[PDB]
Symmetry: C2
Subunit: 367 residues, 2 copies
């Protein structure tokens, strides 16, 4: 008899890594063709994004099945650990098989391999269930539809870390000046070759800041959560799926625009991605408020001390993104500056959120 906490943490890390594999082809796509071939590049980008979304949803369904499986199975052991490793190895083949099926939809080998992988996952899970039932001491006490908050938190942390570190990984792997180019194309100057990669550094800064603030909101929310429901799970899944598109948005934004309208369009896309990623968390919070009596702590109830604080912490990014989208639509001249000032201020607001909330409450107090 052994504790299964670390095994489930490792499984969550593996699944979070496997769910964000189809987002690398997205971030590795050309920022622009520079040869008036925008149509084909956008076609391929949209196809890759759809494939990423579908693979993420499938891996999340698998992760939920795993969480239920190990919720009915309390304690683990050596054999159960090896079977869980086998299940993870089987799940690792879902993205490849799905991409193969969607790329060759005419030949039946792709769907065959996909169904084979699914049946293998199911068979491993059934073997785990059988081993757990043959040894009743490996079952939960209640055995001898709320999700597990620990698994949700671990999955979200892994996804956020990967999405925040994608760009720095790409930089460290690829954007390192080489002596030849440094002293040939930049006239013997390292500072020039480093400044040439300024846009990527700024994109990484912005993506990391945004992802970290979203994770901060998520962590402040789930600190007052008692029972995670399946609707909250779906909403968090959608939020995490739309969070993987922040690196691409920032890459496009930091890229030099061929025409002034492309800058506005890219800012709109980035603001929409952020708005979705944050409004899904806000929807999770509202669905929790629906049954706060059995979903949230008394501190964030209707009338608590940290209720308005959490409201604002979760509605800051959606409101800012909506205002930026409007400025892009209505003003259309000061949109980039507004977006940059939002990027620079939202962190400051998160830091001084309590003072601003108090000031606003005092403003509504005597008015």
């Amino acid at each position: 008899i052994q504790c299964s906490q670390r095994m489930l943490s490792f499984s969550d890390a593996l699944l979070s890594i496997i769910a964000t594999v189809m987002i690398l082809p997205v971030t590795h796509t050309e920022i622009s063709p520079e040869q008036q071939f925008d149509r084909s590049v956008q076609r391929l980008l949209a196809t890759r994004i759809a494939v990423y979304l579908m693979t993420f949803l499938i891996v999340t369904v698998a992760w939920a099945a795993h969480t239920r499986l190990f919720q009915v199975v309390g304690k683990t052991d050596d054999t159960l650990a090896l079977l869980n490793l086998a299940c993870m190895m089987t799940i690792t083949f879902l993205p490849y098989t799905f991409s193969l099926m969607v790329t060759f939809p005419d030949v039946p080998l792709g769907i065959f391999l996909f169904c084979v992988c699914v049946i293998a996952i199911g068979v491993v899970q059934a073997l785990i269930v059988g081993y757990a039932f043959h040894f009743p001491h490996l079952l939960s006490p209640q055995i001898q539809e709320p999700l597990s908050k620990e698994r949700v938190e671990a999955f979200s942390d892994g996804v956020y870390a990967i999405v925040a570190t994608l760009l720095i990984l790409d930089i460290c792997e690829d954007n390192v000046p080489d002596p030849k180019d440094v002293k040939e194309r930049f006239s013997g100057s390292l500072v020039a070759a480093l400044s040439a990669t300024g846009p990527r550094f700024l994109a990484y800064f912005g993506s990391f800041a945004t992802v970290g603030l979203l994770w901060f909101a998520h962590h402040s929310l789930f600190l007052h959560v008692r029972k995670a429901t399946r609707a909250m799970g779906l909403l968090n899944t959608l939020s995490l799926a739309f969070v993987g598109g922040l690196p691409l948005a920032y890459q496009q934004t930091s890229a030099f625009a061929r025409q002034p309208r492309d800058e506005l369009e890219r800012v709109r896309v980035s603001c929409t991605i952020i708005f979705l990623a944050s409004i899904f968390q806000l929807a999770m919070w509202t669905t929790a408020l629906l049954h706060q009596a059995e979903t949230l702590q008394p501190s964030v109830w209707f009338g608590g001390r940290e209720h308005v604080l959490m409201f604002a912490k979760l509605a800051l990014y959606p409101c800012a993104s909506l205002l930026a989208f409007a400025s892009t639509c209505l003003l259309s001249r000061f949109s980039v500056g507004i977006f940059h000032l939002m990027q620079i201020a939202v962190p400051c607001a998160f830091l001084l959120l309590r003072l601003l909330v108090g000031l606003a409450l005092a403003t509504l107090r005597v008015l």
Copy 2:
């Protein structure tokens, strides 16, 4: 006042991702030049490996400093969370700055940037300490050199997951057949194009199996650990550093050998990597046995029930690697088959380890 468990888990995930960034250039190096340029490719590979080792050690020192910092700081808050995000962002620049300094050792800008990043990390940590001391309620009770087992476990899990998923990530990103090549170079056959990528699938299978079994040994060990020391931390750091070289070893092994001696050499390299990765864990276990009274549970003491079991679970891989190295040295004809049979059996031994241990104890019993 908020719990800092999830914040430290996120920090550990980020640091584990940042520590394994310099291993991607290693796995992305050409398996062979095929033009009799082995010398230059091996030079670059060794340089990349040394850079990876140094960056891993530096990031591990930073992670240890962070663990001590948040061991003296018990509880966290919003400001502390934002400062920890800033510290992580600063640490994320250590690999890039170190590679820049080691690539341009003549110009002082690289070492300048490295020292600037180090001083920024130090300043963020000092600000965290000051904020924690100005608010005594954020300090540990003992405040108002054993490491923290949770941080070690999380870091190890992240490293193992990344090292196990590197190859499947590369496959899903790169080794997906395209219709044009499929129906042009393979004469209209998808199964042929898929079998053409068989070596990479086998390499991923082997790497995942080995990394998962090493993680299984680590998880069985740290389940009986009470107090992790700094020597055990150094040994685990070395083990994790040498674990990142398993993907490259398996890539080289699965690659077709130009001459029969290159196969033996690659098998020797793989066996040596595995031997180091496992013997460092064995050394950690022995250093724990040294002070078991305050480092291990009574179950794995000298004379316990699970003592020999853990001995064998930790000494299985080193002994197998040593036997394979010998076979490469002495036999030199059946070395590849022996290595493959070890790869296929070590999992079976882990599964049936208790029965084999009992059989061996009965063999020493009546003999």
